[PDB]
Amino acid sequence: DEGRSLKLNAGLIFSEDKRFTHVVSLLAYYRPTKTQFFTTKTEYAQILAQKKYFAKIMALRTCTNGVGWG
Amino acid sequence: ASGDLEVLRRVKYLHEVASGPYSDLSDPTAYLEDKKD
Amino acid sequence: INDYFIDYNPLFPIFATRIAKGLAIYRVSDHARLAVIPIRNINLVANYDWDTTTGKFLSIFFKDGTIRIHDIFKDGRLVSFLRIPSTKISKGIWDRIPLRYEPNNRDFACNIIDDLPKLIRFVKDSKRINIVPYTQPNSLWRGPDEDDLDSNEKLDVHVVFNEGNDKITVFFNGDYAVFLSVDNIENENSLKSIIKVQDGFYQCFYEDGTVQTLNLGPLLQSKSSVNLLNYIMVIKELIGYMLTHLE
Amino acid sequence: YIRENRENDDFIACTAKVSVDGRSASLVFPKEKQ
Amino acid sequence: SVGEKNFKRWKYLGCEAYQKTVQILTLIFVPACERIIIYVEKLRAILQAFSIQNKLSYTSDLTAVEVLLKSSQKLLTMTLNSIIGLGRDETLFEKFFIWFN
Amino acid sequence: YRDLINSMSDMEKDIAQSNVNSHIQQHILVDLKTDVFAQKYPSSQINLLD
Amino acid sequence: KFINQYWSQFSKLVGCPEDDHELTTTVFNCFESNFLRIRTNEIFDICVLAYPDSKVTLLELRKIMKDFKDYTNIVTTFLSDFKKYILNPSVTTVDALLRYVKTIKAFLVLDPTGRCLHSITTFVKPYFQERKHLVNVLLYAMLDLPEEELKEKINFNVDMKALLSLVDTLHDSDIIRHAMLYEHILNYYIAWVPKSSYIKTNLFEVLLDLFESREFFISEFRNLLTDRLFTLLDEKWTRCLKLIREKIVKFTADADQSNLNSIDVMLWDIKCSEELCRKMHEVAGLDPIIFPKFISLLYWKYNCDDLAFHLPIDLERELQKYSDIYSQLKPGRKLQLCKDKGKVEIQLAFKDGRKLVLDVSLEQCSVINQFDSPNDEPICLSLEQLSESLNIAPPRLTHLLDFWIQKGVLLKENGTYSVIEHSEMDF
Amino acid sequence: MKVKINEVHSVFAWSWHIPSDEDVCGICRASYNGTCPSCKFPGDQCPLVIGLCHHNFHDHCIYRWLDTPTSKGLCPMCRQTFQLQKGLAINDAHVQKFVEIVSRRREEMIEEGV
Ligand SMILES: [Zn+2]
Ligand SMILES: [Zn+2]
Ligand SMILES: [Zn+2]
Secondary structure (H helix, E strand, O other): OHHHHHHHHHHHHOOOOOHHHHHHHHHOOOOOOOOOOOOOOOOHHHHHHHHHHHHHHHHHHHHHHHHHHO | OOOOHHHHHHHHHHHOOOOOOOOOOOHHHHHHHHHHO | OOOOOOEEOOOOOEEEEEEOOEEEEEEOOOOOEEEEEEOOOHHHEEEEEEOOOOOOEEEEEEOOOEEEEEEOOOOOOEEEEEEOOOOOOOEEEEEEEEOOOOOOOOOOOOOOOOOOOOOEEEEEOOOOEEEEEOOOOOOOOOOOOOOOOOOOOEEEEEEEEEOOOOEEEEEEOOOEEEEEOOOOOOOOOOEEEEEEEEOOEEEEEEOOOOEEEEEOHHHHHOHHHHHHHHHHHHHHHHHHHHHHHHO | OEEOOOOOOEEEOOOOOOOEOOEOOOOOEOOOOO | OOHHHHHHHHHHHHHHHHHHHHHHHHHHHHHHHHHHHHHHHHHHHHHHHHHHHOOOOOOOOOHHHHHHHHHHHHHHHHHHHHHHHHHHHHHHHHHHHHHHO | OHHHHHHHHHHHHHHHHHHHHHHHHHHOEEEEEEOOOOOOOOOOOOOOOO | OHHHHHHHHHHHHHOOOOOOHHHHHHHHHHHHHHHHHHHHHHHHHHHHOOOOOOHHHHHHHHHHOOOHHHHHHHHHHHHHHHHHHOOOOOOOHHHHHHHHHHHHHHHHHHOOOOHHHHHHHHHHHHHHHHOOOHHHHHHHHHHOOOHHHHHHHOOOOOOHHHHHHHHHHHHOOOOOHHHHHHHHHHHHHHOOOOOOOOOOOOHHHHHHOOOOOOHHHHHHHHHHHHHHHHHOOOHHHHHHHHHHHHHHHHHOOHHHHHHHHOHHHHHHHHHHHHHHHHHHHHHHOOOOOEOOEEEEHHHOOOOOOOOOOOOOHHHHHHHHHHHHHHHHHOOOEEEEEEEEEEEEEEEEEOOOOOEEEEEEEHHHHHHHHOOOOOOOOOOOEEHHHHHHHHOOOHHHHHHHHHHHHHOOOEEEEOOEEEEOOOOOOOO | OEEEEEEEEEEEEEEEOOOOOOOEOOOOOOEOOOOOOOOOOOOOOOOEEEEOOOOEEEHHHHHHHHOOOOOOOEOOOOOOEOOEOOOOOOOHHHHHHHHHHHHHHHHHHHHOOO
């Protein structure tokens, strides 16, 4: 809820692009995070193992988004 | 406080994609080996 | 298709032809049937008139006093039913006059109905009682066409002439009716054709060569008079609108 | 002449070229035999 | 006669008989009666102006408009009395069935 | 309620017939039937077709 | 041109120097604003009629439009005229679609993003669903079928010039693994700029957006492919199926896969038919004249479950031998001949030296084989004898016999069908 | 008239011969002439097998079921020990595969004390 209002205020200031909404989406911590995975493997178990590893990495990102959001 | 473009792009890439030994580019001992990463 | 009938639509390449089962519609380019209007007896139909302004609708006049209008675009679906109290119809013409109320500084007559929120109807289906936005009974064939970028409100005038007596009846907006009594009832001259000059200006041509002119011009040029015509129609509708919900 | 087969009524299509300022209209003559 | 089956129907029929009735009085009659009043008032103004603007010898009497004005005004006062009245009915309605249950 | 609404509806038809029709008819002019073709053809009975 | 004609006079009128740079700049800014306004007014005829001749000024228009109001005005006007003119049911549906895709490519070139295309598509699709024959003609246009198959079961005329034009527009195409990870992953973030996307540059996806579900599209694609495979694949359809397969897999409901699974099976069915026939000819010395197709019944939607007509004895014996070998090669499987399905190339040799080669169905070949005279005797057969010999109902036989009469092979005299052996008219 | 036949393009439909709304796999519920959810092409890519209990399954459906520890090597429809019917040419190519899985599951049941 706060992210929607804050993005509107930022657009009121300068806007002229969709940069601010995207960076909030990258940096927000209370919403599901969009992830990119390589997974240069074909076996299902290996793909699941890599996806879980990346989920743990994204969990680290969510934890440390405090410095950015402040 | 400028909202630069290319700077945002570089910090974006460093933000995304874990890289490291995993992906592409004795139990406590394994726990410590992971914990370092 | 060989027939002495058929009137071509001025705005689209479509004609209205007459066949035994009813009024029929065939595209000019393809000769392909488009719509069928079920009519019982041809002799009852005094005449049929197309829509000059838009061409999406079509008008049918009955001798007994009923006017029925069907849209071509909906596969000939009936869209509205009209009645005129105790009138024998000889030949009727349908005209649509678009009003242009350009903003003028000297006009301080602001509108507040637009400001007040629009009403809603109450309609109950079998499952539960539902509530829908309010639409006027004749608004479906009068609503602002999705087609018309110039969505200016269009005055709807139906002009009716009575046989055997040359009485002139003018019908506005589908609800209000005005009767005009002609002085020249000495001769029972059949009315040959109706010609429209511009919006609200008509010339009537009888068999004896006499020409009768009906002019809507003074009414169209008076902004208040048209508003008077619109107001009296609304008041009658809303009274029945409450009465419909009371029952 | 526009004729519907050899056993139906014949109706006249009088394409009267009334040159009114270079333009002309069209007429159709119905058949109602006297 | 009553049983459990009709009791729930009795409550369901009664609640819609009052709570839906007040809705149609407030959401329909009041906005409509105000709109009737605004239109007849505009109806009266137009006729009065042309009685002076034309200065035509024959005049159309305005008692027909005035009767409609008071009658429509009488309605709006009369509908508001019912809406308050159905308000009291709902209170009496609910207290009856909570004991009848 | 039914009596009051019908009282207004019946009275509403009276205002339309008594006053509105009187005003609309005054602003509506119907030109008297006239013969135009007599000037060109004064010694012929005229029959009009379309 | 305007400056050379009036600027010196205007400068004299004002009295300002001829080299007033900022006045000329403002005059130019007004000229392009007037150019924009005129183009917005005329955008309908610009995109519908003059395209692609007016393509160049569309690209120039792209250089000018900068505000969202400009885009919302350009679309709301363009819808208004298009719906005014094209969305008339009195307009032929084939030309309506031809003009429609002409606007789609015109606006796609004008707008690379395609958001305006999405707005147009959302606004227009119900009118497409209003018209009935749109699905059949568009998919037939997608697959580029010959006009003969169009005219067999479609009862309204279709403009061949409109057909050829839309095929040309449809075929218009003007619109290690560790090394890519360093390059591409980094490169995608080297250059970056800020209801789902639904704005893909593919026009064929926009065409698919007509259907509420692509299920009917793939089902009819299945039906047409089965009809062609039974008739005989052209390379043109391999591109079509490739475009279909590429888009659905990217998106990934249950029945969508149901009509997406076995499309590869009839491809496998024909591929296995091509391979198995070669094996059968090598082992048992089969007649190399017969090319059987082994199809799997469930996926051709062919309802095996009035057609008990007798094939010629020689052909039936040869076809039965194929079934026996198939049971030997694939244990546990039985093979059933689809007698209503199949094409036979027959050569008819007349006594006057005429040779007629025609592709006929198994039913038509059975009828004409009854008139094969080994002893050169003229065979005259009545309808009742043909029905008994071939076990075919008389009404169906009359249609089959009418086909041969139309081809000039059989002549009907006094209720008996005889062969035309001598034609007294130049072939 | 002489009719000479130059080329014949005949169409044949193949179906499974089952030694007799019930031509469906007891496990996946798909048609015998259809494919199981794990296979894409019919026939050789998704063959049928017949057990001694006369229950018919896709080869992958019953093999996966028998590979579950809860099956105990029993038929899903009759709970008898699943053995392929001998003498059916449809089962000949799958005899060794199913004997191994049933034997392996029997040995595991012996090891688990049940
Ligand atoms: Zn199965
Ligand atoms: Zn399988
Ligand atoms: Zn069993």
